[PDB]
């Protein structure tokens, strides 16, 4: 196979251009342009930089005596229709655009960024998530979830930012109303997991504290916002729970990425405690409870028909639910000047598990489809890659396990290779291409059916243990054989 290392330098993020297949890797003090085979095409230094979280960029040494040599782990790495988006942990989390194909050619870097252009989290231990979309006239847009960073000299958790503003010096800024207005950012401590787009809305998976609750505890939430809403009137928040909460902290999630369906409609979530667990939230069930929460807080003053409090205004904001007409949602589905906002369901979307892993703390999820069989790839805190079959049967079957690097957490940025024949797996210091179908290993029948993989089976026509698509002939499945040899 093939592996990528950087003399022990840590790898934060990974992104793939679906057009070229080129891989972009965001590391500490480094930016890497890698071929599909993990061959070095370019290197850019995010550099060790003399900085302090108590100073503002640009940093003139004379006005920052507290500065020490600071490392710049990558905080955000997204592929826009025309450029690479890069934000670092350093310099108040400012960003820059770079050419896809030659990351060394810088495209856009505001020369005097303002306090509105501090995009990413400036602490390398706080995570930043992002998403690139288009506005109503095609404008490139950056949606950013950013956790609470303390020393910073208060950036709202969710922000919509312009990538092609009229003035290229105002890039990475948000109109003062295209933000989520949270009061006590420190008492909600947002920890962001991922961000994805469904149709005309953006969604955010994150953990925050329920300040209205026992111990002000951390819960798992998903939130939705209309892509077009430049005022966040449409913002809703559902809490997510698996088995009531025996585990109860979403650590990673992904949708089924395959050749036939590129982005399915079920969100596979990994929870941890110690035992981990993998649950399914169908995304139409999320859109339902979100819509029910809107209708309740818009029309029935946050209460339901029986009168139970179902929805509520969220985050210290000074609004209340309303008795607006029943056709208000079907007339302002993304909100208005005077519709309740922001909103939260007091009723969680519960899921029962589909798989438990005892001594495993899951850190990464990725899902695809072979035939009609659904297959999950799961990374853990010990550098392991579990391959699991959920498919059209019942109760998941973990069928393989590998050790990418001992005791090194697996990165959630598990990406496929476009032909979905490989998976890119990273472990803090190592990035590896991984065959989804390790069939060739076994070259006789007893082997191909001993080592049991849903991808693999014995083509008797040829002399090979292979995928099905590699035979319209006679092929014996290794998982549910049905015959012998």
């Amino acid at each position: 196979p093939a592996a990528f290392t950087a003399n022990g330098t840590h790898l934060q993020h990974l992104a793939r251009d679906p057009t070229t297949g080129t891989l972009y890797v965001g590391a500490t003090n480094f930016l890497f342009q890698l071929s599909p085979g993990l061959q070095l095409e370019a290197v850019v230094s995010t550099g060790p930089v003399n900085d302090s979280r108590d100073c503002l960029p640009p940093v003139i040494p004379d006005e920052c005596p507290q500065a020490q040599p600071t490392n710049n782990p990558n905080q955000l790495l997204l592929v826009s229709p025309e450029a690479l988006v890069v934000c670092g942990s350093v310099h108040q989390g400012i960003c820059e655009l770079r050419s896809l194909g030659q990351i060394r050619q810088l495209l856009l870097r505001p020369e005097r960024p303002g306090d509105t252009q501090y995009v990413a989290a400036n602490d390398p231990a706080v995570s930043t998530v992002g998403l690139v979309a288009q506005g109503l006239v095609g404008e490139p847009l950056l949606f950013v979830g950013r956790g609470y960073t303390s020393r910073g000299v208060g950036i709202p958790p969710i922000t919509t930012r312009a990538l092609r503003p009229p003035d290229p010096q105002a890039a990475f800024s948000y109109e003062e109303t295209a933000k989520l207005a949270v009061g006590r950012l420190s008492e909600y401590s947002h920890h962001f997991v991922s961000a994805f787009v469904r149709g005309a809305s953006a969604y955010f998976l994150f953990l925050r504290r329920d300040l209205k609750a026992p111990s002000r505890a951390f819960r798992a939430y998903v939130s939705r916002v209309c892509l077009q809403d430049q005022h966040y009137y449409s913002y809703v928040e559902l809490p997510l729970a698996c088995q009531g909460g025996r585990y109860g902290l979403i650590q990673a999630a992904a949708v089924a990425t395959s050749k036939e369906v590129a982005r399915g409609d079920v969100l596979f979530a990994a929870f941890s405690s110690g035992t981990s667990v993998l649950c399914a939230f169908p995304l139409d069930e999320v859109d339902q409870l979100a819509n029910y929460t809107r209708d309740a807080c818009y029309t029935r003053e946050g209460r339901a028909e029986n009168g139970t409090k179902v929805a509520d205004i969220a985050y210290d904001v000074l609004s209340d639910c309303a008795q607006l007409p029943v056709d208000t949602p079907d007339a302002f589905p993304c909100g208005s000047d005077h519709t309740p906002s922001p909103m939260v369901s007091c009723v969680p979307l519960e899921a029962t598990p589909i798989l438990e892993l005892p001594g495993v703390q899951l850190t990464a999820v990725a899902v695809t489809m072979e035939d009609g069989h659904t297959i999950a790839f799961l990374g853990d805190s010990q550098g392991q890659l579990h391959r699991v079959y959920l498919g059209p049967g019942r109760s998941a079957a973990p069928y393989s396990k590998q050790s990418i690097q001992p005791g090194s957490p697996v990165n959630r940025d598990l990406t496929f290779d476009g032909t979905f024949e490989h998976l890119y797996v990273a472990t803090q210091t190592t990035l590896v291409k991984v065959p989804v179908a390790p069939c060739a290993q076994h070259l006789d029948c007893d082997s191909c059916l001993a080592h049991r993989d849903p991808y693999c089976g014995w083509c008797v026509l040829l002399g090979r243990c292979s995928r099905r698509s590699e035979c319209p002939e006679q092929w014996l499945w290794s998982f549910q054989p049905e015959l012998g040899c």
Epitope: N7, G8, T9, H10, N71, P73, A125
Partner: nanobody, 124 residues
Framework: QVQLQESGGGLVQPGGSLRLSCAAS????????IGWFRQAPGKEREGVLC????????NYADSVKGRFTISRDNAKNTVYLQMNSLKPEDTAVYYC?????????????????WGKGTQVTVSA
């Protein structure tokens, strides 16, 4: 809460020994390169000793050759600076930091995280 704690600093008699420790919390330092630094009053923060993620590479500052000793315990999430000999010019606040940069090496130029520091004072 990612944090680095320094312990063991205090007052000593020249020629004395002293063991400083650097406990990590909120993260495992198993794959980080750890470095000890110090800052005497008025002067710039210099580095004292550095160690790779594997412990296989250690690099010193010329002024402490054969006097100070670094060692790491990944399972304990702590790192120790054994300071023997001891000098009035050794008096400073000793900081401990971790880097995710070239961790298979003992360079320690840039740092990811820092400790609040513990003062070691040597009677003049």
């Amino acid at each position: 809460q990612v944090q680095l704690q320094e312990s063991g600093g205090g007052l000593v008699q020249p020629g004395g020994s002293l063991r400083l420790s650097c406990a990590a919390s909120g993260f495992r330092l198993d794959y980080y390169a750890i470095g000890w630094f110090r800052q005497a009053p008025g002067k710039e923060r210099e580095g004292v000793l550095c160690i790779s993620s594997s412990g296989g590479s250690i690099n010193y500052a010329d002024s402490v050759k054969g006097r100070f000793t670094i060692s790491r315990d990944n399972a304990k999430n702590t790192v120790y600076l054994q300071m023997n000999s001891l000098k009035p010019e050794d008096t400073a606040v000793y900081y401990c930091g971790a880097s995710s940069y070239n961790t298979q090496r003992a360079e320690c130029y840039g740092m990811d995280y820092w400790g609040k520091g513990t003062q070691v004072t040597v009677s003049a």
